[PDB]
Amino acid sequence: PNMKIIGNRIERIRSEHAETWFFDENHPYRTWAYHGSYEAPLINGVVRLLSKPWDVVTGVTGIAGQQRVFKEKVDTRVPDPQEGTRQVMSMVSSWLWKELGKHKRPRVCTKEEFINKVRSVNDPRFWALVDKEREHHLRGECQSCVYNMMGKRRAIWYMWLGARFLEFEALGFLNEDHWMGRENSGGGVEGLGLQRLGYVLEEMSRIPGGRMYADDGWDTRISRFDLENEALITNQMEKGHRALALAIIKYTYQNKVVKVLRPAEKGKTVMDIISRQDQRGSGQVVTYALNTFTNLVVQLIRNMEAEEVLEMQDLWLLRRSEKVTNWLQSNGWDRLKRMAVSGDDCVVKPIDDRFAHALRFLNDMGKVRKQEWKPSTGWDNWEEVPFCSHHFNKLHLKDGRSIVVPCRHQDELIGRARVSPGASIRETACLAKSYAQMWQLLYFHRRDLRLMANAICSSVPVDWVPTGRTTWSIHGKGEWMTTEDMLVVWNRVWIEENDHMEDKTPVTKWTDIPYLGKREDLWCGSLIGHRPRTTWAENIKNTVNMVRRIIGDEEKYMDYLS
Protein backbone atom coordinates (compact mmCIF):
# COMPACT_ATOMS: atom_id res chain seq x y z
CA PRO A 1 0.00 0.00 0.00
CA ASN A 2 1.03 3.60 -0.79
CA MET A 3 0.34 5.17 2.68
CA LYS A 4 1.13 8.66 1.28
CA ILE A 5 -1.98 8.27 -0.99
CA ILE A 6 -4.36 6.20 1.27
CA GLY A 7 -3.28 7.35 4.81
CA ASN A 8 -5.51 10.49 4.94
CA ARG A 9 -8.69 8.47 4.15
CA ILE A 10 -7.72 5.78 6.75
CA GLU A 11 -7.14 8.51 9.42
CA ARG A 12 -10.55 10.16 8.65
CA ILE A 13 -12.33 6.79 9.15
CA ARG A 14 -10.42 6.04 12.42
CA SER A 15 -11.38 9.56 13.70
CA GLU A 16 -15.10 8.85 13.14
CA HIS A 17 -14.85 5.55 15.14
CA ALA A 18 -11.93 6.33 17.56
CA GLU A 19 -13.40 4.49 20.60
CA THR A 20 -14.29 1.19 18.77
CA TRP A 21 -11.28 1.16 16.36
CA PHE A 22 -9.03 -1.92 16.70
CA PHE A 23 -6.60 -4.04 14.64
CA ASP A 24 -7.80 -7.67 14.15
CA GLU A 25 -4.68 -9.85 13.71
CA ASN A 26 -6.98 -12.76 12.70
CA HIS A 27 -8.53 -10.84 9.70
CA PRO A 28 -9.25 -13.04 6.60
CA TYR A 29 -7.61 -10.76 3.92
CA ARG A 30 -4.82 -12.26 1.77
CA THR A 31 -4.51 -10.11 -1.43
CA TRP A 32 -5.98 -6.88 0.03
CA ALA A 33 -3.96 -4.75 2.48
CA TYR A 34 -5.77 -4.60 5.87
CA HIS A 35 -5.69 -1.45 8.04
CA GLY A 36 -8.15 -1.92 10.86
CA SER A 37 -11.67 -2.48 12.06
CA TYR A 38 -14.38 -0.90 14.21
CA GLU A 39 -17.78 -2.04 15.61
CA ALA A 40 -20.77 -1.64 13.25
CA PRO A 41 -24.60 -2.06 13.73
CA LEU A 42 -38.86 -8.04 -0.53
CA ILE A 43 -41.71 -9.10 -2.94
CA ASN A 44 -43.88 -6.89 -5.21
CA GLY A 45 -47.30 -8.03 -3.96
CA VAL A 46 -49.16 -6.86 -7.15
CA VAL A 47 -46.87 -8.89 -9.45
CA ARG A 48 -46.92 -11.92 -7.11
CA LEU A 49 -50.79 -11.93 -7.02
CA LEU A 50 -50.79 -11.98 -10.85
CA SER A 51 -48.08 -14.66 -11.34
CA LYS A 52 -49.29 -17.59 -9.14
CA PRO A 53 -47.86 -20.36 -11.53
CA TRP A 54 -44.38 -18.98 -10.85
CA ASP A 55 -44.66 -19.34 -7.06
CA VAL A 56 -43.33 -22.98 -7.50
CA VAL A 57 -40.65 -22.09 -10.14
CA THR A 58 -37.21 -21.82 -8.34
CA GLY A 59 -35.81 -20.04 -11.43
CA VAL A 60 -38.25 -17.23 -10.48
CA THR A 61 -38.26 -17.30 -6.61
CA GLY A 62 -34.45 -17.76 -6.38
CA ILE A 63 -33.87 -14.26 -7.88
CA ALA A 64 -35.53 -12.63 -4.76
CA GLY A 65 -22.77 -13.71 2.89
CA GLN A 66 -20.74 -10.60 1.89
CA GLN A 67 -17.51 -12.24 3.27
CA ARG A 68 -18.17 -15.47 1.23
CA VAL A 69 -18.48 -13.42 -2.05
CA PHE A 70 -15.31 -11.46 -1.06
CA LYS A 71 -13.07 -14.52 -0.29
CA GLU A 72 -14.14 -16.49 -3.41
CA LYS A 73 -14.45 -13.72 -6.07
CA VAL A 74 -12.63 -10.49 -4.92
CA ASP A 75 -9.71 -11.63 -2.65
CA THR A 76 -7.60 -13.00 -5.54
CA ARG A 77 -4.43 -11.97 -7.40
CA VAL A 78 -2.79 -12.97 -10.74
CA PRO A 79 0.80 -12.39 -12.14
CA ASP A 80 1.77 -9.21 -14.02
CA PRO A 81 1.67 -9.53 -17.84
CA GLN A 82 5.13 -9.81 -19.43
CA GLU A 83 6.96 -6.64 -20.68
CA GLY A 84 6.09 -7.16 -24.37
CA THR A 85 2.39 -7.74 -23.57
CA ARG A 86 2.44 -4.48 -21.48
CA GLN A 87 4.04 -2.56 -24.45
CA VAL A 88 1.36 -3.90 -26.85
CA MET A 89 -1.40 -2.95 -24.33
CA SER A 90 -0.04 0.57 -24.04
CA MET A 91 0.42 1.06 -27.84
CA VAL A 92 -3.12 -0.17 -28.63
CA SER A 93 -4.64 1.88 -25.75
CA SER A 94 -2.82 5.04 -26.92
CA TRP A 95 -4.01 4.43 -30.54
CA LEU A 96 -7.60 3.79 -29.41
CA TRP A 97 -7.82 6.92 -27.21
CA LYS A 98 -6.52 8.97 -30.17
CA GLU A 99 -9.18 7.48 -32.52
CA LEU A 100 -11.96 8.14 -29.96
CA GLY A 101 -10.80 11.75 -29.47
CA LYS A 102 -10.40 12.57 -33.19
CA HIS A 103 -13.99 14.00 -33.41
CA LYS A 104 -14.59 14.78 -29.69
CA ARG A 105 -12.91 16.98 -27.08
CA PRO A 106 -12.81 16.14 -23.32
CA ARG A 107 -14.73 18.52 -21.05
CA VAL A 108 -15.60 19.11 -17.40
CA CYS A 109 -19.20 18.12 -16.62
CA THR A 110 -21.16 20.64 -14.51
CA LYS A 111 -22.91 20.74 -11.08
CA GLU A 112 -26.12 21.58 -13.05
CA GLU A 113 -25.64 18.56 -15.43
CA PHE A 114 -25.44 16.28 -12.32
CA ILE A 115 -28.56 17.92 -10.69
CA ASN A 116 -30.68 17.40 -13.89
CA LYS A 117 -29.39 13.77 -14.09
CA VAL A 118 -30.43 12.69 -10.49
CA ARG A 119 -34.10 13.67 -11.24
CA SER A 120 -34.84 10.32 -13.03
CA VAL A 121 -28.18 17.84 -3.62
CA ASN A 122 -30.89 20.54 -3.09
CA ASP A 123 -29.06 21.33 0.22
CA PRO A 124 -26.04 23.71 -0.23
CA ARG A 125 -24.13 21.95 2.64
CA PHE A 126 -23.59 18.93 0.28
CA TRP A 127 -21.92 21.13 -2.39
CA ALA A 128 -19.81 22.72 0.42
CA LEU A 129 -18.53 19.17 1.29
CA VAL A 130 -18.04 18.57 -2.51
CA ASP A 131 -16.03 21.88 -2.83
CA LYS A 132 -13.93 20.94 0.25
CA GLU A 133 -12.98 17.49 -1.17
CA ARG A 134 -12.30 19.12 -4.61
CA GLU A 135 -9.83 21.52 -2.85
CA HIS A 136 -8.05 18.54 -1.27
CA HIS A 137 -7.80 16.93 -4.78
CA LEU A 138 -6.35 20.11 -6.33
CA ARG A 139 -3.65 20.15 -3.54
CA GLY A 140 -2.77 16.46 -4.08
CA GLU A 141 -4.81 14.93 -1.19
CA CYS A 142 -8.01 12.81 -0.70
CA GLN A 143 -10.05 12.63 2.52
CA SER A 144 -13.35 10.88 1.65
CA CYS A 145 -13.31 8.98 -1.70
CA VAL A 146 -13.88 5.59 0.01
CA TYR A 147 -16.03 2.66 -1.18
CA ASN A 148 -18.62 0.74 0.90
CA MET A 149 -18.56 -2.84 -0.38
CA MET A 150 -21.84 -4.77 -0.59
CA GLY A 151 -21.70 -8.46 -1.54
CA LYS A 152 -24.62 -10.20 -3.29
CA ARG A 153 -24.58 -14.01 -2.69
CA ARG A 154 -20.99 -10.49 -7.36
CA ALA A 155 -19.56 -7.47 -5.48
CA ILE A 156 -21.19 -4.00 -5.64
CA TRP A 157 -18.97 -1.10 -4.58
CA TYR A 158 -20.87 1.97 -3.32
CA MET A 159 -19.54 5.51 -2.85
CA TRP A 160 -21.23 8.60 -1.36
CA LEU A 161 -22.96 11.00 -3.83
CA GLY A 162 -20.14 13.57 -3.38
CA ALA A 163 -17.41 11.19 -4.61
CA ARG A 164 -19.68 10.16 -7.55
CA PHE A 165 -20.14 13.89 -8.40
CA LEU A 166 -16.32 14.50 -8.39
CA GLU A 167 -15.92 11.47 -10.69
CA PHE A 168 -18.74 12.75 -12.98
CA GLU A 169 -17.13 16.24 -13.02
CA ALA A 170 -13.75 14.89 -14.23
CA LEU A 171 -14.69 11.88 -16.40
CA GLY A 172 -18.48 12.00 -17.06
CA PHE A 173 -17.78 13.45 -20.56
CA LEU A 174 -17.05 9.85 -21.69
CA ASN A 175 -20.77 9.03 -21.12
CA GLU A 176 -22.38 12.46 -21.70
CA ASP A 177 -20.65 12.95 -25.06
CA HIS A 178 -21.01 9.25 -26.08
CA TRP A 179 -17.30 8.45 -26.58
CA MET A 180 -18.27 4.71 -26.63
CA GLY A 181 -21.23 5.20 -29.02
CA ARG A 182 -21.00 3.07 -32.20
CA GLU A 183 -20.47 6.12 -34.45
CA ASN A 184 -17.44 7.27 -32.47
CA SER A 185 -15.90 3.92 -31.50
CA GLY A 186 -16.92 1.49 -34.27
CA GLY A 187 -17.20 -1.40 -31.81
CA GLY A 188 -19.14 0.26 -28.96
CA VAL A 189 -22.99 0.19 -28.60
CA GLU A 190 -23.43 2.89 -25.93
CA GLY A 191 -26.74 4.72 -26.27
CA LEU A 192 -28.39 1.90 -28.22
CA GLY A 193 -31.55 0.45 -26.74
CA LEU A 194 -32.08 -3.28 -26.33
CA GLN A 195 -34.44 -2.97 -29.38
CA ARG A 196 -31.43 -2.11 -31.61
CA LEU A 197 -28.78 -4.63 -30.47
CA GLY A 198 -30.16 -7.56 -32.44
CA TYR A 199 -29.82 -5.59 -35.68
CA VAL A 200 -26.14 -4.86 -34.80
CA LEU A 201 -25.49 -8.62 -34.45
CA GLU A 202 -27.28 -9.32 -37.74
CA GLU A 203 -25.17 -6.60 -39.51
CA MET A 204 -22.00 -8.20 -38.06
CA SER A 205 -23.14 -11.69 -39.25
CA ARG A 206 -22.92 -10.40 -42.84
CA ILE A 207 -19.29 -9.18 -42.57
CA PRO A 208 -17.13 -11.85 -44.34
CA GLY A 209 -14.86 -13.85 -42.02
CA GLY A 210 -14.92 -16.47 -39.29
CA ARG A 211 -17.63 -17.45 -36.77
CA MET A 212 -19.05 -14.98 -34.22
CA TYR A 213 -17.25 -15.28 -30.88
CA ALA A 214 -18.86 -14.25 -27.61
CA ASP A 215 -16.53 -15.31 -24.82
CA ASP A 216 -17.48 -14.10 -21.33
CA GLY A 217 -15.23 -11.82 -13.13
CA TRP A 218 -14.12 -9.10 -15.58
CA ASP A 219 -13.88 -6.29 -12.93
CA THR A 220 -11.55 -8.46 -10.75
CA ARG A 221 -9.23 -9.03 -13.79
CA ILE A 222 -8.63 -5.31 -14.51
CA SER A 223 -4.91 -4.88 -13.76
CA ARG A 224 -2.88 -1.89 -12.58
CA PHE A 225 -1.55 -1.76 -16.20
CA ASP A 226 -5.15 -1.62 -17.59
CA LEU A 227 -5.79 1.31 -15.14
CA GLU A 228 -2.66 3.15 -16.37
CA ASN A 229 -3.71 2.66 -20.03
CA GLU A 230 -7.25 3.89 -19.25
CA ALA A 231 -5.65 7.00 -17.64
CA LEU A 232 -3.96 7.97 -21.00
CA ILE A 233 -7.17 9.98 -21.71
CA THR A 234 -5.73 12.77 -19.40
CA ASN A 235 -3.24 13.58 -22.26
CA GLN A 236 -6.16 15.04 -24.27
CA MET A 237 -7.31 17.28 -21.40
CA GLU A 238 -6.53 20.95 -20.78
CA LYS A 239 -4.55 21.65 -17.51
CA GLY A 240 -7.48 22.51 -15.14
CA HIS A 241 -9.56 19.50 -16.23
CA ARG A 242 -6.42 17.28 -16.19
CA ALA A 243 -5.81 18.13 -12.46
CA LEU A 244 -9.38 17.08 -11.52
CA ALA A 245 -9.15 13.84 -13.62
CA LEU A 246 -5.68 12.79 -12.33
CA ALA A 247 -7.00 13.01 -8.72
CA ILE A 248 -10.07 10.78 -9.53
CA ILE A 249 -7.79 8.26 -11.26
CA LYS A 250 -5.31 8.29 -8.29
CA TYR A 251 -7.87 7.83 -5.43
CA THR A 252 -11.05 6.34 -6.91
CA TYR A 253 -9.38 4.02 -9.44
CA GLN A 254 -5.68 3.26 -8.71
CA ASN A 255 -5.36 3.53 -4.86
CA LYS A 256 -8.71 2.39 -3.51
CA VAL A 257 -9.84 2.33 0.14
CA VAL A 258 -12.85 0.13 0.94
CA LYS A 259 -15.14 -0.46 3.97
CA VAL A 260 -16.44 -4.13 4.20
CA LEU A 261 -18.72 -5.79 6.84
CA ARG A 262 -17.62 -9.00 8.65
CA PRO A 263 -19.45 -11.11 11.32
CA ALA A 264 -18.02 -11.09 14.89
CA GLU A 265 -18.73 -12.79 18.31
CA LYS A 266 -22.27 -13.46 19.71
CA GLY A 267 -24.31 -12.09 16.76
CA LYS A 268 -22.37 -8.80 16.41
CA THR A 269 -20.72 -7.25 13.28
CA VAL A 270 -17.43 -5.39 12.50
CA MET A 271 -16.40 -3.11 9.60
CA ASP A 272 -12.95 -3.69 7.99
CA ILE A 273 -10.79 -1.03 6.27
CA ILE A 274 -8.91 -2.53 3.33
CA SER A 275 -7.05 -1.31 0.22
CA ARG A 276 -6.12 -2.50 -3.31
CA GLN A 277 -4.29 -0.89 -6.26
CA ASP A 278 -5.76 -2.96 -9.11
CA GLN A 279 -9.26 -4.32 -10.05
CA ARG A 280 -12.25 -2.20 -11.12
CA GLY A 281 -14.36 -0.50 -8.45
CA SER A 282 -17.70 -1.78 -9.80
CA GLY A 283 -20.67 0.61 -10.09
CA GLN A 284 -18.77 3.90 -10.50
CA VAL A 285 -19.87 6.72 -12.92
CA VAL A 286 -17.56 5.69 -15.83
CA THR A 287 -17.09 1.96 -14.98
CA TYR A 288 -19.06 1.01 -18.10
CA ALA A 289 -17.15 3.35 -20.46
CA LEU A 290 -13.72 2.21 -19.09
CA ASN A 291 -14.69 -1.47 -19.27
CA THR A 292 -15.81 -0.93 -22.92
CA PHE A 293 -12.51 0.82 -23.70
CA THR A 294 -10.30 -1.93 -22.21
CA ASN A 295 -12.44 -4.73 -23.70
CA LEU A 296 -12.03 -3.09 -27.16
CA VAL A 297 -8.18 -2.98 -26.59
CA VAL A 298 -8.23 -6.69 -25.54
CA GLN A 299 -10.18 -7.74 -28.68
CA LEU A 300 -7.87 -5.78 -30.98
CA ILE A 301 -4.88 -7.57 -29.33
CA ARG A 302 -6.53 -10.99 -29.73
CA ASN A 303 -7.14 -10.22 -33.47
CA MET A 304 -3.44 -9.18 -33.90
CA GLU A 305 -2.31 -12.49 -32.35
CA ALA A 306 -4.82 -14.47 -34.52
CA GLU A 307 -3.60 -12.68 -37.68
CA GLU A 308 0.04 -13.53 -36.71
CA VAL A 309 0.99 -9.78 -36.38
CA LEU A 310 2.13 -10.62 -32.81
CA GLU A 311 4.41 -13.64 -32.42
CA MET A 312 5.25 -15.74 -29.28
CA GLN A 313 8.62 -13.85 -29.03
CA ASP A 314 6.56 -10.55 -28.53
CA LEU A 315 5.13 -11.57 -25.09
CA TRP A 316 8.56 -11.20 -23.40
CA LEU A 317 9.58 -8.00 -25.24
CA LEU A 318 8.20 -6.12 -28.24
CA ARG A 319 11.46 -5.31 -30.13
CA ARG A 320 9.91 -3.45 -33.10
CA SER A 321 6.64 -1.47 -32.80
CA GLU A 322 6.14 -0.58 -36.54
CA LYS A 323 4.19 -3.79 -37.42
CA VAL A 324 1.63 -3.10 -34.64
CA THR A 325 1.26 0.60 -35.71
CA ASN A 326 0.92 -0.44 -39.35
CA TRP A 327 -1.80 -3.01 -38.44
CA LEU A 328 -3.71 -0.45 -36.32
CA GLN A 329 -3.53 2.26 -39.02
CA SER A 330 -4.45 -0.20 -41.85
CA ASN A 331 -7.02 -2.44 -40.10
CA GLY A 332 -7.89 -1.04 -36.66
CA TRP A 333 -11.19 0.57 -37.72
CA ASP A 334 -12.27 -2.44 -39.84
CA ARG A 335 -11.63 -4.66 -36.76
CA LEU A 336 -13.55 -2.31 -34.39
CA LYS A 337 -16.59 -2.44 -36.75
CA ARG A 338 -16.40 -6.30 -36.49
CA MET A 339 -17.19 -5.96 -32.72
CA ALA A 340 -20.13 -5.23 -30.41
CA VAL A 341 -18.73 -4.37 -27.00
CA SER A 342 -20.89 -3.32 -24.06
CA GLY A 343 -18.67 -3.02 -20.98
CA ASP A 344 -17.47 -6.56 -20.17
CA ASP A 345 -19.89 -8.09 -22.77
CA CYS A 346 -18.44 -8.69 -26.27
CA VAL A 347 -19.16 -10.26 -29.64
CA VAL A 348 -16.42 -10.38 -32.34
CA LYS A 349 -16.59 -11.33 -36.09
CA PRO A 350 -12.85 -11.99 -36.86
CA ILE A 351 -11.46 -12.21 -40.43
CA ASP A 352 -11.11 -16.08 -40.04
CA ASP A 353 -11.24 -18.71 -37.25
CA ARG A 354 -7.57 -18.39 -36.14
CA PHE A 355 -9.18 -16.08 -33.47
CA ALA A 356 -10.52 -19.19 -31.66
CA HIS A 357 -6.99 -20.33 -30.61
CA ALA A 358 -5.44 -16.81 -30.27
CA LEU A 359 -5.07 -17.18 -26.47
CA ARG A 360 -1.42 -16.40 -25.54
CA PHE A 361 -1.80 -12.61 -25.11
CA LEU A 362 -5.34 -12.98 -23.73
CA ASN A 363 -4.14 -15.32 -20.99
CA ASP A 364 -0.92 -13.31 -20.32
CA MET A 365 -3.14 -10.23 -19.76
CA GLY A 366 -5.08 -12.18 -17.12
CA LYS A 367 -8.29 -12.00 -19.27
CA VAL A 368 -9.24 -15.74 -18.74
CA ARG A 369 -12.48 -17.01 -20.44
CA LYS A 370 -15.44 -18.19 -18.24
CA GLN A 371 -10.29 -24.78 -19.99
CA GLU A 372 -7.72 -21.94 -20.25
CA TRP A 373 -6.07 -23.30 -23.40
CA LYS A 374 -9.14 -24.89 -25.06
CA PRO A 375 -9.93 -22.94 -28.30
CA SER A 376 -13.13 -20.83 -28.13
CA THR A 377 -16.32 -22.17 -29.79
CA GLY A 378 -17.81 -19.70 -32.25
CA TRP A 379 -21.43 -19.39 -33.41
CA ASP A 380 -22.61 -19.96 -36.99
CA ASN A 381 -26.08 -18.46 -36.27
CA TRP A 382 -26.26 -14.83 -35.06
CA GLU A 383 -29.73 -15.56 -33.55
CA GLU A 384 -28.05 -17.84 -30.98
CA VAL A 385 -25.24 -15.50 -30.01
CA PRO A 386 -25.46 -14.38 -26.36
CA PHE A 387 -24.99 -10.62 -25.80
CA CYS A 388 -25.89 -8.49 -22.75
CA SER A 389 -27.78 -11.48 -21.18
CA HIS A 390 -30.02 -11.79 -24.29
CA HIS A 391 -30.21 -13.50 -27.66
CA PHE A 392 -31.97 -11.88 -30.65
CA ASN A 393 -34.55 -13.37 -33.00
CA LYS A 394 -35.98 -12.37 -36.37
CA LEU A 395 -39.77 -12.45 -36.40
CA HIS A 396 -42.41 -11.15 -38.89
CA LEU A 397 -45.29 -8.77 -38.47
CA LYS A 398 -48.69 -9.98 -39.86
CA ASP A 399 -48.07 -7.82 -42.99
CA GLY A 400 -44.78 -9.71 -43.68
CA ARG A 401 -42.24 -7.14 -42.47
CA SER A 402 -39.36 -8.59 -40.39
CA ILE A 403 -38.37 -7.25 -36.92
CA VAL A 404 -35.44 -8.41 -34.71
CA VAL A 405 -36.40 -8.77 -31.05
CA PRO A 406 -34.54 -9.34 -27.77
CA CYS A 407 -35.20 -12.49 -25.75
CA ARG A 408 -33.95 -14.16 -22.57
CA HIS A 409 -35.16 -17.00 -20.36
CA GLN A 410 -38.60 -15.99 -19.04
CA ASP A 411 -37.88 -17.03 -15.42
CA GLU A 412 -35.34 -14.18 -15.22
CA LEU A 413 -37.92 -11.65 -16.44
CA ILE A 414 -40.69 -12.71 -14.06
CA GLY A 415 -38.26 -13.21 -11.17
CA ARG A 416 -36.96 -9.65 -11.54
CA ALA A 417 -40.51 -8.17 -11.78
CA ARG A 418 -41.41 -9.89 -8.48
CA VAL A 419 -38.57 -8.00 -6.63
CA SER A 420 -39.61 -4.74 -4.90
CA PRO A 421 -36.88 -2.48 -3.34
CA GLY A 422 -37.55 -0.84 0.05
CA ALA A 423 -40.37 -1.40 2.60
CA SER A 424 -47.27 0.66 -0.11
CA ILE A 425 -49.77 -0.53 -2.82
CA ARG A 426 -49.21 2.75 -4.81
CA GLU A 427 -45.42 2.19 -5.14
CA THR A 428 -45.70 -1.56 -5.84
CA ALA A 429 -48.53 -1.04 -8.37
CA CYS A 430 -46.64 1.75 -10.23
CA LEU A 431 -43.47 -0.44 -10.32
CA ALA A 432 -45.53 -3.46 -11.54
CA LYS A 433 -46.92 -1.16 -14.30
CA SER A 434 -43.30 -0.22 -15.25
CA TYR A 435 -42.37 -3.93 -15.68
CA ALA A 436 -45.60 -4.74 -17.58
CA GLN A 437 -45.06 -1.81 -20.04
CA MET A 438 -41.41 -2.81 -20.51
CA TRP A 439 -42.63 -6.28 -21.44
CA GLN A 440 -45.17 -4.83 -23.91
CA LEU A 441 -42.39 -2.88 -25.64
CA LEU A 442 -39.62 -5.47 -25.73
CA TYR A 443 -40.87 -8.92 -24.77
CA PHE A 444 -44.36 -8.82 -26.40
CA HIS A 445 -43.34 -11.97 -28.34
CA ARG A 446 -43.43 -14.10 -25.14
CA ARG A 447 -46.95 -15.53 -24.66
CA ASP A 448 -46.91 -15.57 -20.88
CA LEU A 449 -45.52 -12.02 -20.62
CA ARG A 450 -48.02 -10.49 -23.09
CA LEU A 451 -50.88 -11.95 -20.98
CA MET A 452 -49.27 -11.19 -17.59
CA ALA A 453 -48.44 -7.64 -18.71
CA ASN A 454 -52.07 -7.07 -19.91
CA ALA A 455 -53.32 -8.43 -16.53
CA ILE A 456 -51.03 -6.04 -14.61
CA CYS A 457 -52.01 -3.06 -16.76
CA SER A 458 -55.71 -3.98 -16.30
CA SER A 459 -55.20 -4.11 -12.47
CA VAL A 460 -53.42 -0.74 -11.98
CA PRO A 461 -55.40 2.61 -12.35
CA VAL A 462 -54.93 4.01 -15.88
CA ASP A 463 -53.77 7.42 -14.68
CA TRP A 464 -51.07 6.04 -12.30
CA VAL A 465 -47.65 6.96 -13.66
CA PRO A 466 -45.07 4.07 -13.87
CA THR A 467 -42.22 4.59 -11.33
CA GLY A 468 -39.09 2.78 -10.19
CA ARG A 469 -36.31 1.03 -12.08
CA THR A 470 -36.96 -2.05 -14.20
CA THR A 471 -33.30 -2.34 -15.24
CA TRP A 472 -29.77 -1.10 -14.42
CA SER A 473 -28.53 -1.71 -18.02
CA ILE A 474 -27.50 1.30 -20.13
CA HIS A 475 -29.54 -0.42 -22.89
CA GLY A 476 -32.76 0.27 -20.89
CA LYS A 477 -33.93 3.59 -22.34
CA GLY A 478 -37.18 3.65 -20.28
CA GLU A 479 -39.64 4.38 -23.16
CA TRP A 480 -42.16 2.33 -21.15
CA MET A 481 -42.01 4.87 -18.22
CA THR A 482 -45.11 6.77 -19.39
CA THR A 483 -48.95 6.87 -19.46
CA GLU A 484 -48.86 7.28 -23.27
CA ASP A 485 -50.71 4.33 -25.00
CA MET A 486 -48.15 1.49 -25.34
CA LEU A 487 -49.25 0.64 -28.92
CA VAL A 488 -48.34 4.26 -29.88
CA VAL A 489 -44.94 3.89 -28.08
CA TRP A 490 -44.41 0.44 -29.68
CA ASN A 491 -44.95 2.06 -33.15
CA ARG A 492 -42.55 4.91 -32.37
CA VAL A 493 -39.81 2.48 -31.24
CA TRP A 494 -40.24 -0.35 -33.77
CA ILE A 495 -41.48 1.48 -36.90
CA GLU A 496 -40.91 5.27 -36.85
CA GLU A 497 -37.55 5.56 -35.13
CA ASN A 498 -36.33 2.11 -36.21
CA ASP A 499 -33.70 2.68 -38.98
CA HIS A 500 -33.88 -1.04 -39.70
CA MET A 501 -37.61 -0.86 -40.64
CA GLU A 502 -37.58 0.42 -44.24
CA ASP A 503 -41.35 0.53 -44.65
CA LYS A 504 -42.89 3.09 -42.23
CA THR A 505 -46.49 1.73 -42.40
CA PRO A 506 -47.84 1.90 -38.77
CA VAL A 507 -49.10 -1.22 -36.96
CA THR A 508 -52.72 -0.66 -35.81
CA LYS A 509 -53.41 -3.65 -33.54
CA TRP A 510 -51.56 -5.91 -31.09
CA THR A 511 -52.73 -9.07 -33.00
CA ASP A 512 -50.50 -7.99 -35.92
CA ILE A 513 -47.48 -8.15 -33.52
CA PRO A 514 -46.01 -11.67 -33.42
CA TYR A 515 -45.07 -14.18 -30.76
CA LEU A 516 -42.01 -16.42 -30.99
CA GLY A 517 -42.84 -19.88 -32.45
CA LYS A 518 -44.29 -22.17 -29.72
CA ARG A 519 -41.12 -24.34 -29.75
CA GLU A 520 -38.86 -21.25 -29.10
CA ASP A 521 -41.23 -19.77 -26.48
CA LEU A 522 -41.14 -23.16 -24.61
CA TRP A 523 -37.32 -23.45 -25.04
CA CYS A 524 -37.05 -20.03 -23.38
CA GLY A 525 -39.18 -20.99 -20.39
CA SER A 526 -42.83 -20.53 -21.42
CA LEU A 527 -45.39 -22.37 -19.29
CA ILE A 528 -47.87 -22.47 -22.22
CA GLY A 529 -49.75 -25.77 -22.13
CA HIS A 530 -48.64 -26.54 -18.49
CA ARG A 531 -51.88 -27.11 -16.45
CA PRO A 532 -51.22 -24.49 -13.58
CA ARG A 533 -50.54 -21.86 -16.31
CA THR A 534 -53.72 -22.90 -18.20
CA THR A 535 -55.69 -22.47 -14.89
CA TRP A 536 -54.03 -19.05 -14.33
CA ALA A 537 -55.02 -17.87 -17.85
CA GLU A 538 -58.58 -19.18 -17.50
CA ASN A 539 -58.97 -17.45 -14.07
CA ILE A 540 -57.09 -14.21 -14.99
CA LYS A 541 -60.17 -11.86 -15.09
CA ASN A 542 -61.15 -12.92 -11.52
CA THR A 543 -57.52 -12.35 -10.40
CA VAL A 544 -57.54 -8.83 -11.99
CA ASN A 545 -60.85 -8.06 -10.23
CA MET A 546 -59.30 -9.11 -6.86
CA VAL A 547 -56.33 -6.73 -7.39
CA ARG A 548 -58.70 -3.85 -8.45
CA ARG A 549 -60.66 -4.49 -5.19
CA ILE A 550 -57.47 -4.18 -3.08
CA ILE A 551 -56.22 -1.00 -4.83
CA GLY A 552 -59.74 0.48 -4.83
CA ASP A 553 -62.86 -0.07 -6.95
CA GLU A 554 -63.35 3.77 -7.08
CA GLU A 555 -60.22 4.08 -9.32
CA LYS A 556 -60.50 4.10 -13.14
CA TYR A 557 -59.26 0.85 -14.81
CA MET A 558 -58.98 -0.29 -18.45
CA ASP A 559 -59.45 -3.92 -19.60
CA TYR A 560 -56.29 -4.70 -21.65
CA LEU A 561 -57.22 -8.42 -21.68
CA SER A 562 -60.51 -8.03 -23.70
Which residues of the chain form contacts with Zn ion (CB under 5 A)?
Answer: 142, 145, 251, 407, 524
Decide: 46 and 279 in contact? Cβ < 8 Å.
no
- Residue closer to Zn ion by CB (options 8, 90) is 8
Determine the Cα–Cα distance for residues 200 and 499; give it in Å rounded to an integer.
Answer: 11
Specify the residue, 21 or 515, whose C-beta has the smaller distance to Zn ion: 515
Q: How far is the CB of 328 from Zn ion (least distance, A)?
A: 35
Q: How far is the CB of 103 from Zn ion (least distance, A)?
A: 32
Smallest distance, Å, CB 197 to Zn ion? 14
407 annotated ligand-binding residue: yes
Residue with Cβ nearer Zn ion (91 or 109): 109
- In contact, 17 and 270? CB cutoff 8 Å: no
Nearest approach in angstroms of CB 438 to Zn ion is 16
Nearest residue (CB) to Zn ion, 381 versus 467: 381
- Integer CA distances (angstroms), 9 to 14, 76, 160, 270, 274, in order: 9, 24, 14, 18, 11
430 is in an annotated binding site: no
DSSP annotation of 178:
T
| CA proximity to 460, closest of 494, 476, 483, 438 | 483
The residues that bridge with 213 in the sheet, in sequence order, are 348
* Of residues 484, 465, 454, 450, the one with CA closest to residue 544: 454
* Shorter beta-carbon distance to Zn ion: residue 77 or 139: 139
Are the CB atoms for 57 and 289 separated by under 8 Å? Answer: no
Listing DSSP states for 246-310 in one string gives HHHIIIIISSEEEEEEEE-STT-EEEEEEEESSS--TT-TTHHHHHHHHHHHHHHHHHHHHTTSS
Q: Determine whether the annotation assigns residue 445 to a binding site.
A: no
At position 486, the amino acid (one-letter code) is M
Closest CA to 547 of 429, 452, 430: 429
> Of 277, 248, 195, whose CA–CA distance to 471 is shortest?
195
Has 137 been labeled as part of a binding site? yes
Query: Where would I find the H helices in 443-530?
Result: 447-459, 486-491, 518-523
CB of 202 to Zn ion, least distance (A): 16
Name the minimum Å distance from CB 395 to Zn ion: 11
Produce one character per residue of 132-154: b if its CB has 16 or more CB atoms within 10 Å, e if not.
Answer: ebbebbeeebbebbbbebbbeee
Q: Which is nearer to Zn ion, 59 or 468 (CB)?
A: 59
To the nearest whole angstrom, how small is the minimum distance from the Cβ of residue 216 to Zn ion?
18
State the minimum distance, in angstroms, from the CB of residue 133 to Zn ion: 5
Q: Is 388 annotated as a binding residue?
A: no
Q: Quick one: which of 346, 327, 330, 350 has its CA closest to 338?
A: 350
Please identify, using beta-carbon distances, which residue of 93 and 144 lies nearer to Zn ion: 144
The residue among 241 and 338 lying less far from Zn ion, judged by its C-beta, is: 241
Question: Has 524 been labeled as part of a binding site?
Answer: yes
Task: Report the distance separating Cα 536 and Cα 23, nearest Å.
Answer: 58
Annotated binding site: 133, 137, 142, 145, 391, 407, 524
Annotated binding site for Zn(2+): 133, 137, 142, 145, 391, 407, 524
